[model samples]
Target: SHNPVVMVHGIGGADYNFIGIKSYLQSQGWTSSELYAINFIDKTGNNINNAPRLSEYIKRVLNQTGASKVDIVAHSMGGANTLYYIKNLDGADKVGHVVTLGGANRLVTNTAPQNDKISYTSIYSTSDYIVLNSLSKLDGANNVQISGVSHVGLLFSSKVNALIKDGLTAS
Candidate 1:
């Protein structure tokens, strides 16, 4: 069974940020009902504060979709946001998988959330100009490193789109 995937965009990024990934997942057998993207408008804010909001949204996604757990695909700052939610906001149990594109996941910890039940993946481009590789890779995640993708390009890159699908579908 496929858990619904909830896409989280970077700060200042719109819900359309995951448009390409959404389409790719749909083509790979995920339906629209199994996809969702979140939008928050703020130039600069603390991800700690944002994690609680994400926690609430995730709860609603679970209730509305009737899924026991959902997969999270977060990008850039969204990685920090989601990881915080998972480790500190009691989110690890609610998530089945985690995939981040150029994610700033290590801002919280070097290791993934302490839950063997959850699968975690972190993918980053060597050519990315913004987020450092140090920030994207997590100790316990399926860390992937590619080349030729800019920071913003991670959202729409074909390679990243496929990796997202593979990571989410993996056991």
Candidate 2:
């Protein structure tokens, strides 16, 4: 998918969470115009409440870029927020793919709904101190496991960056 990429930070995280990742994407030839990072003041907001905002953001990106869809790269609680938007808010039509890092998708009992139009890749580290490694795994996604990296380390890990780029460019 050639759609623009949107990066979502985790609970208690600010836009800065993606600073390094943005630079990495730039180094890999993605223009700044094609990258976006959302900032939410209410960092503790639940996914149900956050999903609507995310949906609006995706629509705005699509409108601005004139792209039919966008790819999501999220961390921690932002994973659940993105999934909620895709599964509950009819977002599958607007998203080409998703790459989650240490996402807490299991926080709620509601299982994620499937959409064939969208592909999902979930990456988690066994050393993550935040959510359980298994919690980041989604049934329909390509769940990836790594070792010796903390939850936040994923943002800067070179291995993770390569995996993310691969997922983004994969057909």
Candidate 3:
């Protein structure tokens, strides 16, 4: 599809979560207009596992922009939603690459619970207090874990940025 990137924010977060990353991506030559930030369910509800919302919102965004498909960059609960929408709901096949940041992919034992439908790179931190280690698995792809950083710090860390840059640019 080659559509521009669609960035999904984490739980309890606004677009500000991507402020630095988006600016950096723009500086790398991506047009500001092409970078899209998706925000939903800002109130207390966990937007993840709500595949219907992702499906509906994706359709709206695509129809409004006249684009067929786009790459996804998801973080935290947004990662879970992206996987559910894509893997279970079949929300179109326009996805090029799925880069998940601090995703709760596997779901916690007493919390999100483990599910086995999503496919994507799971990026997370060892020091993350929000998600457990087991929930960080990336299904088939190699799930990555970086040290000495909190969940939010992953947004601006150079190592994480390099991984994303490589993931996006690599064939």
Candidate 4:
């Protein structure tokens, strides 16, 4: 079976953030059924300690889709949570490829233990207010930095679309 693509939202983000991407992929012949979006957190202020919620979501998607593993595309804090799950909770074997958008992998940097197994594409922009050092947001995983756009703008931007399509296809 073809591996499904799972889009995970960051803090305070909703499933709607992936609407544009889902539509684009569908236009490219991927059915909406093959794409899934997750909304686990509502508040962005609290630290996302409940990474198990992500694991549970993964399990739910696996059972519902009847697939062994799925690829992840996480944005903002979702990127950090994805890495946290992969490293601390043995998520590498469970996930295929991880595409992070404006993810803060380093919590204050040189402090957080890095994950080595999770492959990632860390996308961020200099114009984004959420990510101060957009480049340092992700570590160990492959990084992809975007410029001249806000954090939310990445969801529907043509540049993001092209990059994500390229990233997904290359994987």
Candidate 5:
């Protein structure tokens, strides 16, 4: 069985933003119990503070799934938030894989910390004007570039979803 997966939405977005990807994951093998989309009280809040909320949600997911670690799928600002939690809030041990879509990973710092236990995938599209390629793709991460797809499109794109699945199961 696979570890549980947590979906963290971008700024100004809600947990329901992952509906498209959630359905795809369900058909691929993930059960209802194995997937969680976290909802934050402050959707447009700062990442430095939002990171703690993500930690709490992840803790809850681990308890419900009985899994030591949960894979993270973050979009936009959520990517940097998740990274901050893993790199600063003692969250590395609680996470397995990390996949970010059109993320601003370098928002925290260009030199984002790496976790030996986690596989990182930073995927972005050239057409995503908000999340530039320079910031989205990390130095040591499995950085990927896809043209034509916009920021929001990355969530619904089948190609992006396939890449997300691959990154999650890679290590």
Candidate 6:
């Protein structure tokens, strides 16, 4: 009933990476039409370039759903990509809530600063093997700390999923 939710997968990830989360959302009354996933053509491509593509994709989602803005759920490197779009390309005006999981979100660009107008949530685990949990930290975000969950495990962890659900509605 609200703006749609866009799912952005990590580096080397595909739409399938979000299967469980999408299924979980659908089971909770989210229509398939309200949930979108972006698949990158180059898995390990430069995030700066990948961000513009996401900008276009977000435009398409907004046009298709007829919603003013959408929530973003980004995992791993997708976090950097999405944030770059929001910070550098003026995507902050087009987004509502932003939730990142184990994001490798250190600076993607020095040119753009973060926009505080949008709400941000970063969820990370200490046991994450791929990236430092601190890498996902943002200045004004609600940084949720967890333990024992691997980098990829954050996707399937019920606790992390619950946090994501909360982020979907957090002001």
In model 5, where is the ten-residue run with the lowest total lDDT?
108-117
Candidate 3, position 48, lDDT: 51
Clashes of each: 0, 0, 0, 1, 0, 0
Local distance difference test scores for all models: 0.87, 0.84, 0.67, 0.71, 0.85, 0.83
State which candidate has the highest lDDT.
Answer: 1
Question: So what's the TM-score on candidate 4?
Answer: 0.84
* Ten contiguous residues minimizing lDDT sum, candidate 4: 108-117
RMSD of 2: 1.6
What TM-score does candidate 2 get on C-alpha atoms?
Answer: 0.93
Choose the strongest candidate by TM-score.
1
Tens digits of per-residue lDDT for model 2 on 1-171? 367999988889988899888899889988887989989766994876688888888889989889988989999999988888887787878888789899897764234456355778889999999989778888877789999999999999999998888767755
- Tens-place lDDT digits, model 6, residues 1-171: 657988988878987789888888887778887899999887984676689888999999989878999989999999999888887786878998889998877756322234356778889999998979768887678889999999989889889988988888787
Give the TM-score of each candidate.
0.96, 0.93, 0.81, 0.84, 0.95, 0.93
Superposed by TM-score, candidate 2 places the C-alpha of residue 5 at a distance from the truth, in angstroms, of: 0.6
lDDT of 1 at 87: 84
lDDT of 4 by residue, 30-112 (tens): 77898988777654723355467777888888899888888888777776677677767756677766777777767523222
18-97, model 1: which lDDT tens digit per residue?
88888888898999877989886653536856788788888999999889999999999999999999988879889998
Across 1-171, the per-residue lDDT of candidate 3 in tens digits comes to 245777887678766688777777777777777777776765232645455666776677678878877667777877777766665566537565677788776542122212222224667888988876567666565578788878888788878877775555535
- Kindly list the per-residue Cα lDDT of model 5 for residues 1-171, writing each as its tens digit: 788999998889788989988988888888876788988778884876689999998888778767999998999999888888887797878878889998888887675466455788889998998778898988667888989998999889999989988888876
Indicate whether candidate 1 or candidate 6 has the larger lDDT: 1
lDDT for model 3 comes to: 0.67
Global lDDT of model 5:
0.85
